[PDB]
Structure formats: C-alpha cells, structure tokens
Amino acid sequence: EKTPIQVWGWDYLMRQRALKRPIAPHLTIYKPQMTWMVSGLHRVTGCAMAGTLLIGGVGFSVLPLDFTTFVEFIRGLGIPWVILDTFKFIIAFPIAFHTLNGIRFIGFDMAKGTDIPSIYRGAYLVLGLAALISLAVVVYPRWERHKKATLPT
Amino acid sequence: SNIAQYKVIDHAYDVVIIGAGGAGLRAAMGLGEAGFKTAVVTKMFPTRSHTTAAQGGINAALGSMNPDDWKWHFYDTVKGSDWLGDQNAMHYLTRNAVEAVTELENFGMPFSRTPEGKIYQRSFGGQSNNYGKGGVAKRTCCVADRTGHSMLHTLYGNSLRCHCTFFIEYFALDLLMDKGRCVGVIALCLEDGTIHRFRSKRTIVATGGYGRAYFSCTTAHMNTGDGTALATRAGIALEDLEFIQFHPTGIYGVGCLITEGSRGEGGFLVNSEGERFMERYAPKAKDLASRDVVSRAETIEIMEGRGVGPEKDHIYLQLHHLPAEQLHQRLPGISETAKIFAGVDVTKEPIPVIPTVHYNMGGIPTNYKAQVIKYTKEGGDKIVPGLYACGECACHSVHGANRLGANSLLDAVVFGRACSINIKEELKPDEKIPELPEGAGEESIANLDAVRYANGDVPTAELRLTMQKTMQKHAGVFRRGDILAEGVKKMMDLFKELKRLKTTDRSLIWNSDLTESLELQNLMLNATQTIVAAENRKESRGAHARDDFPKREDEYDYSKPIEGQTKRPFEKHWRKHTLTKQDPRTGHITLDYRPVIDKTLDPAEVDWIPPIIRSY
Amino acid sequence: TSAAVTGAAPPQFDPIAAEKGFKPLHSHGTLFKIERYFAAAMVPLIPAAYFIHGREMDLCLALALTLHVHWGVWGVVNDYGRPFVLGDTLAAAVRVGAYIFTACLLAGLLYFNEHDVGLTRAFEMVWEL
Amino acid sequence: KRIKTFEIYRFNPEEPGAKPKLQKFDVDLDKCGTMVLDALIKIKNEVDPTLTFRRSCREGICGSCAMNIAGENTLACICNIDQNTSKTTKIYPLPHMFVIKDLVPDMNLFYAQYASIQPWLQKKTKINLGEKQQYQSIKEQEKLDGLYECILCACCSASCPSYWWNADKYLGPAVLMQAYRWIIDSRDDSAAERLARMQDGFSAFKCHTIMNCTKTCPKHLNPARAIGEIKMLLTKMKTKPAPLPTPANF
Ligand SMILES: Cc1cc2nc3c(=O)[nH]c(=O)nc-3n(C[C@H](O)[C@H](O)[C@H](O)COP(=O)(O)OP(=O)(O)OC[C@H]3O[C@@H](n4cnc5c(N)ncnc54)[C@H](O)[C@@H]3O)c2cc1C
Ligand code: HEM
Ligand SMILES: COC1=C(N)C(=O)C(C)=C(C/C=C(\C)CCC=C(C)C)C1=O
Ligand code: SF4
Ligand code: F3S
Ligand code: FES
C-alpha cells in the first residue's frame, strides 16, 4: 500500500524505461569517502557475520561433521602461529567495528553528531577503537599463554 | 518549414503565462485559485529564474523599524524615476506594497525578524522619510541576503496549491496574433523536440530582462529579452529601452552582484586615496544615493586616476569596519560569494567592485492595468486585446529612467497580482478559447528550422560576443553622440551578419546551440533597439547620461521658478517615453514618442509630484 | 506545418488531488523505535558474552542475533531486491527469502547450541588455536 | 601554455541505439575562467557547440548546473578548476538519474516529490490574506537558518545510495529537509499531517545515515540532521514546540 507520490514514482520509472534512457553512472564513478565507505563496511560486516552464522549453523547441522573435529582439523594443519591470530583479528574486527559504528549510526538517527567534522572524527574513532579492541582481544590471550609457558608459578 | 519536419501539438487554456519568475508565478497563483485553466510556459524550472538571485530586499512601508507612510515611498519612486515614470502605475505600486509584502509573509516567506517579531527592514539607495525632507528610510524588507531566492521558492511552493499546469523547459518562439489580438503562444519543447501551440483567451508576458545584451552584467544567462523580442515580432513597439541600470557593485572580475544592502547596513565605497568619495558626490544620501548617481560617481573616480587595484580600473566596497555578527546575520550570502569569487574575507579586506549592467526599466509598454498598448499621436494609447505584460519585461512604467532598489521584486508581485485581478474582472465565461487562423505559427517554425540548419560562416558564439562588446563600448555609463552613432552602425552591421549564421547541433532534443541561437536573435532585436533609442535621446536623465547633453530636458526649466516661463512644445523637450518599432527581417527601426502620464489614480488619495531638480 | 494533433497536460503530481481519499495511518514509527532500542540493549550483551559463557548465554545470543539479523537483512533485501531491477514476482520471492533466511538462521543456531559445542564454546575454542 | 584536459560524459538520444561515452577536451586555462562551468561554456563556444548542460546564474544560487565533478556532486559555476594540468578532470551527470542528453538529467521525479510535501504555509484557522503579519520570534525564524537556503540542485539526493536504489519510494535528503523546513516553522499548523504523509517504511525511514548528502551539499547545509530530526518526530521521541504566543501590542 503506497502513498500517492510512491504510485506516481513507479509510473515515472516505467515511463523512463520505455524511453530507453540510460542511467547515469554512480558506483563506478563516485569518489570514495569516509561517509559511504564506512556505511559500506557497516553493511558488509553486518551481512558477513549473518552469512557466517547461517553457513555455520545450518552447515554443521546438515553435515556429518561437527565443530570439534573442524577445530582439531585446522589445528592439525599446524599453521604458523602468527597467521592464526590474524584470522582471529579478521573475525573480531567486524564485531567490534560494527558494534561501535552501530552506536554511532544510532546517534545519526537521533540527529546527534551530523556536522561534517563530528562525522569524520566519529569515523576514525570507530575504525581506530575497533582496530584496538580487536587487536587487544587477540594479543591478550597469547600474551597470557606466553606467560604460562615461561614464568615461575 | 523546408529542410525538416516537426510534430505540432495544440492546447487550449484560459490564460497562458510566459514566465515563472516572481511575476509569472504571482499571476499564476491569482488566476489558478480564481478558477482559470492556467498554463505556465517557462524555459527553465521556475526556481532557477533570475528572481531567485535577488538579494537586498523588497520595499514596503511596514513601519517595523520606525514610523513610515506609503506616500513617502511613492515620492521616492517618482523622484527616483527622474519624472519619466508614469505616476498612476507608481501610485498603484506604492499603494499596494504593504498588502503585497504581507501576503508573502502569509504564504510563508521567512523574513528576518525584529525583536518584536515583525519583518526586519533595512536602508537602501535613494529612499527618504517625509517627502525627501526627513532621514534615510528603513523600508526594505529582507530574508537576510537572499530575499528573491526566498520569495521565488515561496511563490513556487504556493503555486503548487493553485492548480496551474507547468510547461517547464518550453522555449516560446512567438505570440500568436490574429488581426491585432493575441490568441496564444507557440513554443519548442526541449525534452522531445516537439512544437506546441497554446491557444488562450489571455496571454501574460513575464519573461524578465536582457542583461546578456552586454558583455558584463549581473544577470543570468537566460536574460536574453525573448519577451520584448516576442512583442517586436508581433509588431508592438518597445518602451524606454535606452534606460539601462548599472548597479554600483558587481564584483570586478566576474559581474556577480554585491547587494546595495551591504551599503544599507553601513558599508561604503572607497577610492585609491582612501576616500569615502560618495560624501563628495552626494552629501546627504552619500553611499545610499540612487543607483544612476552612485555608478557615475564611481566611473568618474576611475576616469580621474583614483581607480583601485593593479590597473586602477575598479573600486572598493568596504564592510570590514562592521561587526562580524552583523555581516553573518545580515549579509551571509555576499560574504560567501566574495570569498568564492574574489578570495576576499569581508571581515578583514574590502571587495573589488565596479558598476555593472543589472536591470532594464525598458520593456513592453503597458497601461496601469498591465495590458499591453500601442500608441499613436492621433489615436493615443490603444490596448492590444488578449495581452498583458508584467515584471522586468514590462514598462508600466513604475521606474521611468531609474529604478529604485528593492522596487522590482515589488513590481513583479504587485503587477503580477494585478494581472490576475484585472483578468478575473474583465474576462467573462461569455468568451470562448479563440480558434487559430490557418497557418498560425508557420513563420516561427520556419525561423526555427533556418537557425537549426544554418550553415553560413559566423558561429553564433562569436557573433554574440561582438554584440556584447559593441554594446559595452558604445552604450555604457556615459554616452556621446559620435560614440553612439558609431555603435549604431556597427550594431546594424552585426544584424546583417545574422544571415551568415553558423550553428552545428542539428538535433531537436535539448539543442541548446539552437535555443542559444534563437536567443541571439532576440538579443539582437533588443540591443539594436536599445542603441538607436539611446543615440537619439539628446538629454541626460536617470541612467541615460549623455556627455554632449548633460541637462535634463523638461517642458519647463524646473531649476528656475515656473511663472513667466512658457512651456516648450512636446517635440522640443525630452520628458517623454521612447517607443521603438523594429522590422525583424530587415532590422530597420523607427522611433516615436509618447507622453509621460503625470496624473495619479485619484487626486483625493494622493497628489501628483511635479518635477524638481534631482539631488541626493 | 500546422497539420497538427491535440495535446495532453504533461505528467505532473498534483498534491491537492493526491490528498483526496488518502488517509492511511500505516505508522512505521514504533517498529523503527523498537528496532533501535533493541540494538542499544545488545551493546552490553556483546561484551557480556566475552566474559560469561554457557548454554543460557548461547541462547540469549541466538535469540537476539536472530531478531536483529531479521530486521537487518529485510533492509538489505529491500535495497537490492527491487521490482524495477528483478520484476515484481522475483522481488516477492526475495522478500519471502528474507523470512526463510531468518528461520533457517534460528533453526541452525538452536541446533548448534543443542547438539554441538554452542556459540560461546566455539569462539572459546577457535581462540585456543 | 597550461592545457587542462576534461573527460566529459556524452549521450545523444537522437542516435540510433545510442550509448553513453566519455569525451576528452583540451582547454587552455590562460584562455578560460577559474570555474568548471567556464570551461564547459568555452568548449561549447569554441570546440563543440553540441555539448549540452544546464546553467543560469553566475553565483551558485539557481541550482541548475548540478553535476558530478572529480567524483563529487557539486555546482559547476562555483567549482574551481583543478590547476594540476597533469591530472585530467572527469565530469558526469548527477548519479543514477535517467539522462536526457549529455549532462542534462530528467529532473521530474525530484520535482514531483517536492510538490508532495505541500511546500506552502498552512493555517488551521483561516486568516485574511495580506491584512497583517503573523508573529514569529527571532529564535523561531532562526530555526529556518540552514533549511530555507536550499536551491533545489539535487546534489545530495543524487549522492545517496538509498535514493539511488529506491528513488520511487524514498523521498531523499533534499525533499525531506524541505519537509522538515515546513514542519519546524512556528507559523505552520500542519506538522502532524506533514509527518502522516511520510509514516511508512520508505518515505523517510529508508535513510541509512550514509552522510553523503551533507558531505556533498555545495551550500554547506545538513539534510542528515533534518532527517534525524524527522526520525525523532515520527518515533515520538521529540515533539514540535507550540508557537510562542503573539505579543499583546503586536
Ligand atoms: C543579482 C540580482 C539581484 C537583484 N536583487 C533585487 C532585490 O534585492 N530587490 C529587487 O526588487 N529587485 C532585485 N533585482 C531585480 C529583480 O530581481 C528582477 O527584476 C525580478 O526578479 C524580475 O523577475 P521577473 O519575474 O520579471 O522575471 P525573471 O525572474 O527573470 O524570470 C523570467 C521568466 O521568464 C521565462 N522566460 C524567459 N524567456 C522565455 C522564453 N523564450 N520561453 C519561455 N520562458 C521564458 C524564464 O524561464 C523565467 O521563468 C535583482 C536582479 C538581479 C539580477
Ligand atoms: C552488538 C551491537 C550491535 C549493534 C548496536 C548493531 C546496530 C545496528 C544498526 C543500528 C543497524 C542498522 C544500520 C542501517 O539501518 O543501515 C544494523 C544493521 C545490521 N546489523 Fe547490526 N548491530 C549489532 C550487532 C550485530 C551483529 C552481531 C550482527 C550479526 C550478524 C549484525 C548484523 C547486522 C545486519 C545484517 C544489519 C543490516 C546492515 C545494513 O542494512 O546496512 N549486527 N546493526
Ligand atoms: C544503502 O546501502 C548501501 C550502502 N549503505 C553503501 O554504503 C554502498 C556503498 C552501497 C552501494 C551498493 C553495492 C556495493 C551493491 C551493488 C548493487 C548494484 C545494483 C550494482 C549501498 O547500496
Ligand atoms: S541540500 Fe544542499 S544539495 Fe541538497 S539540494 Fe538543497 S542545496 Fe542542493
Ligand atoms: S546520503 Fe542518504 S541515507 Fe540518509 S543521511 Fe544522507 S540521506
Ligand atoms: S548556474 Fe546556478 S548553480 Fe550554477
């Protein structure tokens, strides 16, 4: 159930298709900027994490495989410890970033922080805090394993 | 005609309005809500009209800042017109200012406010209290620095509620005449290259001015005098075209306006000797003298070695002594324009400025009901049936030889409104949408085709450019018979070069090489008429300054007492309107003169104002 | 030449005409409100799951992520799954795909919590690598 | 000779099975004005008069010359040409509009949507037109600052991906900021009807806070703030203040 302009809007689109008028390019030509890039990443992350929770949840239930033999399988590959923690960063960033930026965006919905400099300060803070929080949550367990392996008590 | 074929589409309307500036929209509002099936033909989206560039304000004696009377305003307008203004139309204008500006506020025009919540007003050039005798007036109502922008958007918004029908990006080519009557308009639809004839009982011309006839101007690219040209092609004579307002303060390099409101708010002009020279040229009013006076004062300074900058060829507007909260509050727009186009920070540096073509008090001649007229000595003023004209394209004449600042947005609205009032009173359901004569519009189509496929050797851009330069040179702030005669001969030669015209784009769809060529034709008609009229007027009046004839030539010598003088006969003085008839194929122009109307609409409501020497 | 045809008013939205009849009070305000309140509440929930693990938390994650992802994919579906680009029935399919996506997400999460290690242990375990 | 070079989008609807194309033009900057519009006119005037675009004002007030220049939406007439003659400058129409010819977009939906907000003052109690000024305090009129200035160039809406995908249903930054301009007008009595018009899931709420609109607006306005403002109103988090009462001896 559409508003009158929404109906009109639809007929306009059909009128334009009928005239086989081209559509002016957009994605391919718009300058990359910290406004829509950081919106882009909010959606990619949201969707990536949802995609994972489907392919993880349905995947392991439909397949004879279970999570435990999957973990021990990769453990068995014995891959360099440096890389392993990078995978753990790639997994944490989206949760941190998207969560922080989610508070930002909620701000935006309340008309808070919409001036251009607040916007840009906010984008760096969110990107940065998420870089920190993700790195910290990976570095800390390792840091504490190395302490178990190499210190007195 | 000839080399291609054209789709032709007919319509039927009660009235057709050619223009959606302030004037056309106000008429459209009036007529629409009155029931008339009203069509608005404009060559650009209404909001892009030049009205939207207006800045400093709109006049009405509201008394928001101090007591005021509309008769003081009236006096200021008559004196402003240097007695070439018709006092009936000027009476109508000033009488209605308060109601007119008030309506705008009621439509939602967001005027700047006073601490009492009334419409803030400012001082402007050429305005006084108490019939000249009091102080500088505060009559000029504004939305900061963007009064026309705001007004045009308010008028456009409200037009959408008055059931008009918009033909947007339609370029009118001619009025459709049937034996002295106007029965419609013919136009090219830019979108799909088609040709539309609108039939109507009434047609309103509201097409703006012709600033682009000059090389430097404040006006928009679309200011090409198509309306005045339409009237020429319908065999109607144009009025007072030689009276071309130079605004004191266009930015030096680029022609952009800097509002006279910046002087109303306390700015002033300065020469290379650091002198507020308008103290010298106009001791009372100073920097708020009339525009013709201030622009001349500026030009002399330049001619007399006191010009500013590298070439000492312009002058400074100074605002930096004004509080920065006033500049932002009262002149945010020009603060921005000045930075963008001159690198200038108005809080610290002054703006480089120079007088610049700005406004046309000339136009299509009308009566005070805005009905278009033809004139003869024998017959007098004869109205052209079906045809009204208003706004800058019109000559009512509410401005005579010099238009007062903030009176034009006003005259657009007031006489835009008058068009609707007067048509709803005189038009009866009795009358039916007239039928077109056989072949109607063929000439206009033929011309269109010719220009479309024109394969001569002069590209229109260069022909235009020579016209603009010719005009800047031979019809500027100060004029001389020999320079004028020279100019005229060049202009009529350029008009001959129209036959050698080269265009390139041959499409019917959004062909702006074509419309710009059509525009050149219209410009040339205006420009040629302008110059032969100016050439022939051997006096100095308002904006028309002749170095060989520095006197204002009236029926008496109003600088001495009247008694004992014998009135000079009409043919011997110059207190009369100029009428130019032009044959559009050949270019041949004939002149005639029509008497100024001196009476008001009612001597009981207000007296007339007899000429006196014009000082400030 | 003027051997010509009769014309039509251009296409033009008449907002007075449009007003007549139209009431529809189909207010999406409170759904938008709750969507946002919900995400706000998930802020403390994410770090909570960093510290507290187990079945009951695994269940709070599954319920809240499911709800939040349901509203989320519905938005993205309405952006790229538009009748203008996919035609009207393929559009309706993708819209139905939004709901199918949500249900399978939940079933697969309920399964993982009930018959596998569960959410907070699975993370716990990949972090142990 | 500092020769700047311009790659300009081209489209010719007259051509049989026509298709979009970039064209390169060389311009002698010493023979040209400071602004991008100057270069386009120069080309049209000297090189190719078939090149087609909208323009009217000189000072960036009309809103006609809106286009995409060096990847951003702005007005040509006040966009300074980049002096670096080593780089070229790319010029396209407004993103994701249907093009008529070259840089000229069909603009008619944008205008339709604008008509739909009912952009005129509305009063619950009929008033006699022209008879007296309505009262409005400075503080109240100053709420319109940053709203009334919009020139309807559509740079913002042509920058918003949300509007790119759902222009037919989502009103866009420009139209919504005007919707808001009429909502917070202390003199206007229809703030509720104004919101009822845009209650559905798309009209306003398809704003994904991308912030492109505000980034790109050539008049330094903030349609995002206004949309947040509208979101608050639709969700009843905020309410429009009553008008301050008119003074006794007004
Ligand atoms: C920079 C500037 C600032 C100004 N500031 C002020 C001020 O502060 N106060 C004041 O009183 N005055 C001011 N003026 C003067 C005033 O703005 C104008 O005289 C006034 O707006 C006249 O408008 P109009 O409606 O007659 O025509 P315009 O506003 O120019 O509009 C003319 C209309 O006619 C249409 N048209 C023209 N030719 C054709 C054709 N062939 N086919 C179809 N349509 C056509 C156009 O599309 C347009 O809609 C200013 C002028 C300028 C240039
Ligand atoms: C922990 C706190 C979280 C907050 C505060 C939060 C907040 C938000 C907000 C405000 C939006 C709306 C964006 C928009 O309308 O454009 C959103 C979208 C989304 N979120 Fe989250 N979120 C969180 C966690 C998650 C998680 C764990 C997932 C896991 C899959 C997720 C997936 C999504 C998806 C798919 C969208 C739609 C994206 C879009 O339309 O651009 N979110 N989130
Ligand atoms: C409104 O959703 C979107 C964003 N939030 C965002 O930041 C970006 C960059 C986009 C751009 C869309 C992309 C990359 C998907 C491709 C869709 C096509 C029709 C080609 C978007 O749609
Ligand atoms: S907001 Fe800025 S950009 Fe969007 S229309 Fe108004 S002016 Fe053009
Ligand atoms: S760019 Fe688009 S989605 Fe919202 S904040 Fe601005 S409108
Ligand atoms: S020509 Fe008016 S915005 Fe550029």
Residue numbers in the entry:
A (entry chain C): 34 to 186
B (entry chain A): 30 to 645
C (entry chain D): 28 to 156
D (entry chain B): 33 to 282
From the article:
The enzymes of the fumarate respiration are anchored in the inner mitochondrial membrane where complex I (NADH-rhodoquinone reductase) acts as a proton pump that is driven by the oxidation of NADH to NAD+ and coupled to the reduction of rhodoquinone (RQ) to rhodoquinol (RQH2), while complex II, serving as a RQH2-fumarate reductase (QFR), transfers electrons from RQH2 to fumarate. In contrast, mammalian complex II catalyzes the reverse reaction in mammalian mitochondria, where it acts as succinate-ubiquinone reductase (SQR) in the aerobic respiratory chain. Since fumarate respiration is the major pathway of energy metabolism during adaptation to a hypoxic environment for many species of parasites including adult A. suum and bacteria inhabiting anaerobic environments as well as some human cancer cells exposed to low nutrition and low oxygen conditions, the pathway is one of the most promising targets of chemotherapy for both parasitic diseases and cancer. In spite of the similarity in amino acid sequences and three-dimensional structures between A. suum QFR and porcine SQR, flutolanil specifically inhibits the enzymatic action of A. suum QFR.
Like bacterial and mitochondrial complex IIs with known structures, which includes SQRs from Escherichia coli, chicken and porcine as well as QFR from E. coli, the structure of A. suum QFR is composed of Fp (chain A), Ip (chain B), CybL (chain C) and CybS (chain D) subunits. Notably, the A. suum QFR is evolutionally more closely related to the bacterial and mitochondrial SQR (including the larval SQR of A. suum) than to bacterial QFR. In contrast to the hydrophilic Fp and Ip subunits, the hydrophobic CybL and CybS subunits consist of three membrane-spanning α-helices that anchor A. suum QFR to the mitochondrial inner membrane. The interface between the CybL and CybS subunits binds a heme b molecule with coordination bonds from two conserved His 131C and His 95D residues. The RQ binding site of A. suum QFR is constructed by Ip, CybL and CybS subunits and is located in the mitochondrial inner membrane near the surface of the matrix side. Five residues of A. suum QFR (Trp 197B, Ser 72C, Gly 73C, Arg 76C, Tyr 107D) form hydrogen bonds with the quinone ring of the bound RQ, whereas Ser 42C, Ile 43C and Arg 46C of porcine SQR, the equivalents of Ser 72C, Gly 73C and Arg 76C in A. suum QFR do not form hydrogen bonds with the quinone ring of the bound UQ. This is probably due to the steric hindrance between the bulky side chain of SQR Ile 43C and the bound UQ, obstructing the formation of hydrogen bonds. In A. suum QFR, Gly 73C occupies the position of SQR’s Ile 43C. Furthermore, while the quinone rings of the bound RQ and UQ forms hydrogen bonds with residues of quinone binding sites, the isoprene tails extend toward the entrances of the quinone binding sites located in the mitochondrial inner membrane and are not in close contact with amino acid residues.
